[PDB]
Design a protein around this ligand. Structure first.
Ligand SMILES: Nc1ncnc2c1ncn2[C@@H]1O[C@H](COP(=O)(O)OP(=O)(O)NP(=O)(O)O)[C@@H](O)[C@H]1O
Ligand SMILES: [Mg+2]
Lengths: 35, 89, 179, 147
């Protein structure tokens, strides 16, 4: 039972909400969408 | 006619222009051409921002141009693109 | 065709192109223009219907160029030249100045910094510190990892997204590989 | 074309290789006839379109920004009835299909269906005017596929 046990637990299991869209290119080609 | 929009950094000039163009896209989607002239490392940003309207969600009448890209389009229309060009090397 | 002959060739074909004739043109983000770009600009001033020049400056004067020690030296000079040529070609000119600050309406410290940047002597800031932080690092590695932790805090706790953050350097080569 | 060659819009190398008959033929067709006899008309129309990420990628979210998809529309014309889209393809048809164009027609429609749907989505969204019909003119055989 240390003071920061809870917070540390919270941080180490944390995952970015919008993780999935961090690699998705913004600009896309009409030809590429078909691809 | 000319319009000098001037203000310190944080004045809201760019958003004012973005919104101006957006409203003008609303009024007439097929109206006379609207040219957004920005530095080459700023062309995409504005393109994105203009595209972010719930109203229209894109642009057609209004394009974002660099000096170079503008040169490309006007020259595609007027001519003189035939000659090859040389990289700095 | 030399790669720098595009802007020249553009300037002498603008009167020839019809699409330009009815166009509205907005220019922004620029601090200054090369003469070769200026020729294009004035040609647009002639054959386009309307054109707006957005410049970052504080009450620039079209009568004389700024003093060299002025904060808005570049933009001021640009304004002077642009206005000069506009009057030269007898354009009907409309001026709009944005007195208010819209960017830092939410945060006081940065508005104070923006407003009191150039000011001599500078007036101190008496309120609490929250949004302006000066940080000292043991090295560049520590600087980067530090900023990494701050960014992680900013996205975990302060509801910022990664896209809201920006890291600037004067000499990026000092940092990029390590970033 | 030598107005174009002179103004260097096309290199003389490009000029030398052009079927003049193939170009003229489109204008004889009824859709091309509609184009010439049009209330309004515009060509080489560039566009940018925002599309929610979810459409292109599953698991994406509305807060998550739209993707930007850009393109160039070959032709757009407005008759008294409505607004129509026009595209040209230097595709090869007559040379290699068993049913010729009729073998090509289902396949060609497939080849550009996604593209056309994106183009139409663009004009539909940005100008907020539905487009009545879309036409694909193929230089090879002078065929026009309606979509
Ligand atoms: N009316 C407004 N109210 C509040 N914030 C605004 C408003 N208009 C713009 N902003 C925000 O202000 C910030 C900067 O706006 P911007 O249009 O770049 O001003 P600016 O005059 O161009 N500053 P700068 O480009 O540095 O010279 C952005 O974060 C905008 O979202
Ligand atoms: Mg700006």
């Amino acid at each position: 039972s240390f003071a920061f046990d809870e917070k540390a637990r919270e941080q180490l299991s944390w995952t970015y909400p919008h993780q999935e869209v961090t690699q998705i290119r913004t600009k896309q080609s009409v030809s590429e969408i078909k691809r | 006619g000319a319009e000098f929009l001037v203000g310190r950094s944080g004045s809201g000039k760019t958003k004012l222009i973005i919104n101006s163009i957006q409203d003008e896209l609303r009024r007439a989607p097929f109206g006379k051409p609207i040219i957004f002239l920005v530095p080459d490392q700023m062309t995409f940003l504005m393109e994105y921002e203009l595209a972010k309207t719930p109203d229209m969600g894109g642009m057609i009448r209004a394009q974002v141009f660099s000096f170079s890209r503008l040169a490309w389009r006007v020259l595609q229309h007027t001519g003189g693109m035939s000659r090859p060009f040389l990289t700095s090397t | 065709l030399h790669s720098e002959d595009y802007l020249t060739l553009l300037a002498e074909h603008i009167p020839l192109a019809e699409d330009i004739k009815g166009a509205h043109i907005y220019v922004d983000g620029f601090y200054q223009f090369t003469p070769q770009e200026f020729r294009v600009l004035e040609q647009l001033m002639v054959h386009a219907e309307h054109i707006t020049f957005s410049l970052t400056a504080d009450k620039p004067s079209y009568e004389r160029e700024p003093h060299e020690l002025e904060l808005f030296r570049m933009t001021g000079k640009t304004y002077y030249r642009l206005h000069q040529k506009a009057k030269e070609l007898n354009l009907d000119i409309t001026y709009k100045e944005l007195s208010g600050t819209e960017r830092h309406t939410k945060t006081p410290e940065l508005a104070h910094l923006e407003a009191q940047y150039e000011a001599r002597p500078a007036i101190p800031y008496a309120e609490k510190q929250e949004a302006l932080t000066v940080m000292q690092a043991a090295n560049r590695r520590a600087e980067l990892e530090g900023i990494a932790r701050e960014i992680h805090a900013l996205v975990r706790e302060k509801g910022y997204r990664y896209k809201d953050v920006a890291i600037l350097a004067r000499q990026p080569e000092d940092y990029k590989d390590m970033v | 074309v030598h107005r174009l060659y002179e103004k260097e819009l096309l290199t003389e190398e490009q000029k030398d290789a052009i079927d003049i008959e193939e170009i003229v033929q489109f204008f004889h067709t009824e859709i091309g006839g509609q184009l010439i006899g049009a209330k309004w008309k515009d060509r080489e129309i560039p566009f940018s379109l925002a599309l929610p990420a979810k459409e292109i990628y599953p698991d994406a979210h509305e807060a998550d920004e739209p993707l930007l998809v850009q393109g160039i529309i070959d032709c757009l014309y407005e008759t008294e009835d409505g607004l129509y889209l026009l595209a040209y393809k230097s595709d090869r048809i007559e040379g290699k299909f068993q049913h010729g164009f009729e073998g090509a027609a289902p396949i060609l429609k497939k080849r550009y269906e996604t593209q056309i749907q994106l183009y139409t989505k663009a004009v539909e969204q940005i100008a907020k005017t539905k487009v009545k019909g879309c036409a694909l003119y193929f230089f090879d055989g002078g065929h026009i596929l309606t979509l």
